[PDB]
Symmetry: D2
């Protein structure tokens, strides 16, 4: 579908003693790529959607990920994000992460399908909402 | 199978603007719970296994997670980890994360199945190895 | 002054390729130790103080830190926090971080003096407030 | 002195419940800016210096920081780093962090002076070394 791309440089601190990117760092980047996608497609930042419509963001409900090869500091990641499927109150966001060998080869580092929802905070309780029509059209 | 339990207190900084735990923090805890399991079952720390046998740790290759309810600063998480299945060069580590209502009810926060492998660093190249027999027996 | 102590276990992911704790992790722990101090001294969590009195927390305004020796995964940190001085709208929180050799020797890892303030969010603008008298008495 | 500039976009996950950047995130960026400076001045990555000369990186020994105004997700940071003073086995790296109002005004967010050293790992023991002459000339 409608795909957005973003780059992310791996820093020394993003790596573990094993010398490679420590996994939960991938989830930080995927979360940034997730929101970037929305931004880039025109939605306002949560700061604003929360004022205007109660939308605090798009919390994750499910994830399937696979880590194909390692990455390390200085490698520069290219992330590809698109919405793979709209559902009632959820949506599947797909991300492909790769890096580029100096051979100009594009190695797949990781991939992940995130199931998220648009949510509101009903006081202390988080609540999912019907995907907003406006949102679907924007991201379309 | 053989299950280990660990607690984790959520800090203010572990939360996002939405007031709840920011997801990639769960992966940090799951990674700590993963190693804790091994430690608690008797294996030496990677620092040592890398010297003795080249084993740098247990990198993740795949993950399936589901986020059932929200959690926030001050909540105290209880994580349950066990190895669900041994395979040839991989293993499935299962984690269940919950928190306790003051009603003494144990709410499930999240769950996740991690597919990991024992690996070595062959110079700059990460390589999986056959699950060590000794390891299986220890964790058994 | 009134001192609170807390322990913190270093995880593999808290370390960098150099094999030691990556510094910004110390600041996460100091921030947890900062709030823990307040909690432990009786104040309500920010979640509540923000409702009751607008107090969103105690943002940092200044810091002086020194890193005395290294620490790594599995080391267990003991943090000592106290308020070194109350000022008008600020306060100096001091932390001492150490670890224990197996010789039972208590090595100093790091130390840091944090200057923080009680703050409110006046809409999008963060604002410091006069240290609350009640707070001084509680922490005293 | 010789100054390098870098940009850093603040992500939603870099913020706390208070809606602003959680401080230890500044230290991650300063650490990236620190190494970026060296890279940009021509030194090889630690991965390589450790092979060639044992240099594992530039651990921090001391820091003085001041947080002038708040920053939040979507703000884009501009970091300015330079070496303020060479010493025997240490060096003072200075960073200035700012953001740009839409008025085109450049607000100072934070500043920090980091005292670091070039270090080697003598087995499990970290050791500082005399600033390498070559390094001084490169960064000069
Ligand atoms: C999100 C929430 C409140 C939704 O529960 P709910 O309001 O009762 O509504 P619901 O059960 O119908 O779920 C909404 C939709 O998501 C779908 N969904 C929910 N769980 C799953 C799952 N495990 N797998 C697939 N789809 C799912 C539901 O089927 C439903 O579907 P529909 O299209 O058929 O209508 C509940 O799942 C929850 O709290 N999960 C925990 C969320 C969380 O804490 N994730 C970790 C932090 S994410 C941080 C973050 C926040 C904002 C951002 O901008 C980015 C990151
Ligand atoms: C791990 C490595 C090198 C293995 O590739 P390989 O050496 O060619 O061997 P391999 O393909 O046979 O895989 C080994 C086993 O894992 C299984 N496996 C590998 N990928 C998957 C997958 N996507 N789903 C399920 N099982 C998988 C393989 O089937 C194989 O199975 P077997 O039992 O049937 O023999 C390759 O998958 C890789 O580099 N993945 C990237 C790993 C990574 O960077 N994860 C992110 C960082 S994790 C940080 C960390 C490090 C140490 C720790 O202690 C903790 C955290
Ligand atoms: C905090 C705030 C709004 C205060 O500015 P203000 O409202 O105009 O008031 P102010 O200038 O009088 O400062 C209040 C007091 O702090 C003292 N102070 C402020 N800056 C400094 C400094 N650099 N060195 C020493 N003391 C300082 C001031 O002198 C003043 O003192 P006083 O006792 O003599 O009355 C302004 O400094 C600021 O925004 N700094 C940025 C704060 C920030 O973003 N830090 C990074 C994130 S911390 C995340 C966090 C949040 C909540 C938590 O529970 C924990 C962590
Ligand atoms: C770094 C090390 C081993 C140096 O101790 P040492 O080998 O006995 O040598 P030393 O005492 O002469 O210190 C070397 C120079 O730094 C200066 N220095 C050391 N401590 C301080 C301090 N508190 N304030 C100012 N300068 C200092 C020393 O005076 C000395 O100066 P010199 O120019 O007059 O000769 C010891 O301070 C230490 O382990 N500190 C802990 C370091 C640490 O764990 N920081 C947290 C993690 S940083 C992670 C990181 C790693 C690599 C990177 O690329 C980036 C981040």
């Amino acid at each position: 579908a409608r795909s957005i791309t973003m780059q992310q440089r791996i820093e020394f601190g993003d790596c573990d003693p094993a010398g490679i990117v420590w996994y939960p760092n991938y989830h930080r980047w995927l979360d940034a790529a997730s929101r970037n996608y929305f931004i880039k497609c025109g939605l306002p930042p949560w700061r604003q959607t929360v004022v205007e419509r109660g939308i605090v963001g798009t919390p994750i409900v499910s994830c399937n990920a696979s880590f194909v090869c390692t990455a390390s500091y200085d490698d520069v990641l290219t992330i590809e994000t698109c919405i793979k499927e709209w559902r009632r109150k959820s949506f599947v966001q797909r991300h492909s992460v790769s890096r580029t060998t100096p051979g100009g080869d594009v190695q797949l580092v990781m991939r992940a399908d995130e199931i998220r929802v648009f949510a509101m905070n009903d006081g202390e309780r988080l609540r999912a909402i019907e995907v907003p029509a406006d949102y679907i059209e924007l991201c379309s």
